[PDB]
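Homework-ish question, so no full write-ups if that breaks the rules, but can someone show me the predicted structure for this set?
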Amino acid sequence: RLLFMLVLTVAFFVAELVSGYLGNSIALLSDSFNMLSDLISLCVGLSAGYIARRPTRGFSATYGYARAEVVGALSNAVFLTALCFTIFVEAVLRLARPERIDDPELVLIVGVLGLLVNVVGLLILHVMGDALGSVVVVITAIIFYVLPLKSEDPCNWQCYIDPSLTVLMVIIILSSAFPLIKETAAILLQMVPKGVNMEELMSKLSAVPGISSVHEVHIWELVSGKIIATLHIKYPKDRGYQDASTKIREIFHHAGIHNVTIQFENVLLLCNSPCISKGCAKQLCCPP
Amino acid sequence: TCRLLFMLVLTVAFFVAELVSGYLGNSIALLSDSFNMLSDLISLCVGLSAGYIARRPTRGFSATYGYARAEVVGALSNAVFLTALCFTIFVEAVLRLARPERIDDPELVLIVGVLGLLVNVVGLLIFKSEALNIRGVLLHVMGDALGSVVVVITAIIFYVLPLKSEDPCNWQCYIDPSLTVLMVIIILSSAFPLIKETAAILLQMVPKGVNMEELMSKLSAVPGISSVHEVHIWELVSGKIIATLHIKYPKDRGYQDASTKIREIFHHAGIHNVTIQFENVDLISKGCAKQLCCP
Ligand SMILES: [Mn+2]
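A: Not a homework solution, just the prediction itself:
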């Protein structure tokens, strides 16, 4: 399924890239860049599926390459942002010095076929983000198709209709992609996942019976679905820690965190094992 | 920080040279390729924002490790931005190789190219997640410096020879796109290590400095330990490596003797962040076994 979509997207990205420069239409170039980003996303999803089956641990990636989806998503979003910045500059350059579409027919045909390939995805807002760019290409083509302009006549309204719609499409694509950048960065910055409410989680954690303190509660998301929590507990050492460990595990299970590595430091409110020597303080995370 | 700020101010001042107040009209086409430094402006803004975010304290119930990795994420973002711009420049140059393009007037292009080269070399001569971020910003400015070098070179070549409009394009026309392609190759080659390293800091992998080949051997060798389950080693920022080892032990003898030995081994390997969970040996569910990190 996805391989056929990938080959179609690659072929038509190349086709639109060749047509836009040859046809002198920024909207076509914008759609070509958008389909290049779409094929990059498809390749990222294929790689994610491949790595998901037969997980590959080892001495290089102890967690496996599960973060590949997130890293590829961030990289693709930044790539699309840079391509959108380039397209915005070119529109602005061609907004002050208007340029004519040399091949309205070819631009129209490539836009129609790109719109068909863009709707095949739903025939099996980013999805709107690509479909609408294709329809902008078409729109410009008809404006240059019906009521055309002779090859030896200056710029008219028909000329500034392509750069304006291209700027609007760039705005739409950037608005759809910036939240993706924010979410991927939050995942990659080891920020607490959106679903997890660490405030009440820490309250419940401090309410467990026989727990005197709680520190170094590191919660971060590996991938969409796997949340990893590293936590340090202090136990009285004449009572024990088994019941407390079970209760803490149940709490983290209720919150959706199944990866817990509770270190039950002995009992006075600081970490009992910062490092081997006092000189490790600058390197320890969250210095005391 | 201060040097990055001064670079940003200089780039702003030179770029704003197009938005004259005057009257109807904007700067008579001296901005046709002035956005080559608006890209540097954007990269500088990204670097400064990453630096500002990184300074935030490693506390609060939204980032338990703190925004220390903001510099690494900004470096990766800047590297990918530079790669995308280089791809676009390469595509434009390739389209120019098939269709030769002349230069309108070597004088103005040479003058603006010399000014841009001077700005970029002021930025270059300023002379460790911050090392990654600066490496990205310096990569971007070096990229535009190479672009300014190629525009200077094509301008001089078009200056010595007249290239009257009667004659079509000659080797002079192809001098610029070919040098642009070579410059793009150089920038991409320089940028690829940056991405390949920042994607190791992100996309959690064993740190390059860490030599796990002997780490696992020593962890097996230390007496008192009966097995090891999840040696999760990853790098938050350069110099801060975190470990999440799981360990078993005979129930009768506590983990006290072996915990200090494990911590000392990890410290000798340059790992000071270790969270050892000691799961005893008898000698919440099973549906959740699909949501773990190790099956
Ligand atoms: Mn499209």
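Now go work out the reasoning yourself. Hint: The pocket of manganese (II) ion is lined by residues A 31, 34, 114, 118, 130, 133-134 (CB under 6 Å).
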